[PDB]
Known about the structure:
Elements: H1 16-29, H2 32-42, H3 46-54, H4 62-69
Helix pairs in contact: 1-2
Amino acid sequence: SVQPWSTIVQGPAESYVEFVNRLQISLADNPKEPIIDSLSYANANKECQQILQGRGLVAAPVGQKLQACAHWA
């Protein structure tokens, strides 16, 4: 019905790094870059999506997204 990584959603209290890590595990187990770069925005929680929208990093590589959300607690 759904691809396995599609259900990897950042928890309300889960850090952005840990969410990205979970997503990287799901993908490694089941081209990774275009999928991590899209889902690391779409599957992120309201709070972290709001950071990426405001800084204009929606389309940025995951590394830059990680750097931007590193201080979200």
